[PDB]
Amino acid sequence: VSTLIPPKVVSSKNIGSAPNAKRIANVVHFYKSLPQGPAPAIKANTRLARYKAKYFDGDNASGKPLWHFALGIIAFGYSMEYYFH
Amino acid sequence: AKSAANKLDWAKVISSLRITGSTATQLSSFKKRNDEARRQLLELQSQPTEVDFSHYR
Q1: For residues A14 and B30, is the Cβ–Cβ distance under 8 A?
Q2: How many other CB atoms sit within 10 Å of the CB of residue A3?
Q3: A34: left (phi over 0), alpha (psi -120 to 50) or beta
Q4: Which chain A residues are Cβ-neighbours of B12 within 8 angstroms?
């Protein structure tokens, strides 16, 4: 008999139902987000970090470190091969 | 004087493609329309509400 008032009732529930769950999921991660490679930490030195940076990095990612390890184990084992036989 | 009021009312109606599913807003719209139609009909059909005692008597 009178005029009910829909057009300003969105205060109680934000428009949409499915994207409401994703709103909180995607709005919160943008605060603590790296602008462009912040704190890359590409430089380190712990007597083995240089080897990791030079060979164990994703830029090369080749089979050369495995061959170097094989050569090193051969060099180490030559001495005890002489010692045993 | 009434033109502005219903102009803005139907402007809100043109905005109202998104609040679809309302129950009595459109009903109130036809209520206003019926009441103002009865207004203009009664005002147009209303002859001078007095007996012309000079001649009609």
Answers
A1: no
A2: 14
A3: beta
A4: 7
